[PDB]
Write a protein that binds this ligand. Sequence first.
Ligand SMILES: CCC/C=C\C=C\CCCCCCCCCO
Ligand SMILES: CCC/C=C\C=C\CCCCCCCCCO
Lengths: 137, 137
Amino acid sequence: SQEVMKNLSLNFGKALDECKKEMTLTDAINEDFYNFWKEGYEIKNRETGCAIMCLSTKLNMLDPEGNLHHGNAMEFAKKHGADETMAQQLIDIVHGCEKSTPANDDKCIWTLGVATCFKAEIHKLNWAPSMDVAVGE
Amino acid sequence: SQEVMKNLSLNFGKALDECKKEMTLTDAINEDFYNFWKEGYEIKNRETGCAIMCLSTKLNMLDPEGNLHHGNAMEFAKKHGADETMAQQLIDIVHGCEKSTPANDDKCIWTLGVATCFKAEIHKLNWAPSMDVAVGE
Ligand SMILES: CCC/C=C\C=C\CCCCCCCCCO
Ligand SMILES: CCC/C=C\C=C\CCCCCCCCCO
């Protein structure tokens, strides 16, 4: 649901300021987060991949290979309002996008690739929200 | 708590190198200690069963019948940050896993079975650490 996706999106972005400082990321990521759920907007900055990776790492959502930790993603999803089925469906998109995008040793570009694939799949479910406030803000 | 399980996992395995040097053991067990908590991973080596016994025995967590000593297991769990409810929950998993695992006269193998049952239940509670997955150092 769009509603849940808004709540997940705002809770996922809350540490962005903390990641921006800590990783010295430029303001190039600002347009990607402001536009994250705008259908047809292409996210293409490498640093946004870095930012997303930092955000996941901070929510304990990553394993030591860099793939999603299913336990903590499920717990995150549930904490912000998804039921079991919606939570599993989101895990399955992320997991599907990890297997469907080309392996890349540059973790920031690979995380970007996962995130773009995830965004597209959420648009296809008609779950992308209309945000009044940007992710990260 | 995953933070607590991290603290107990680091500290339970601190004497592994001492364990390895004293006994028998191939470096084949390192794969099980380094990857213990990963969601896909199954602990697999027989000497890891033997390592866990030496670590338990050295921490004074094993009774005369070979079973967990609940009093000292409580002390170890609390020392490393478990409150009483989580401590008791860990004891009850161990104790349940001592019952549900098939009897065996190889103690190394039986301990491997109790440890794999313990791991599975910590995954079910979402208490396995997501990025810091090792037992020991
Ligand atoms: C698992 C639930 C995700 C929820 C909300 C996401 C909002 C925008 C961020 C999407 C990126 C998720 C993919 C990340 C895995 C690798 O960091
Ligand atoms: C009850 C406390 C155990 C704490 C931490 C364990 C980390 C690795 C898990 C190994 C399985 C435990 C097996 C029982 C042996 C007694 O310590």
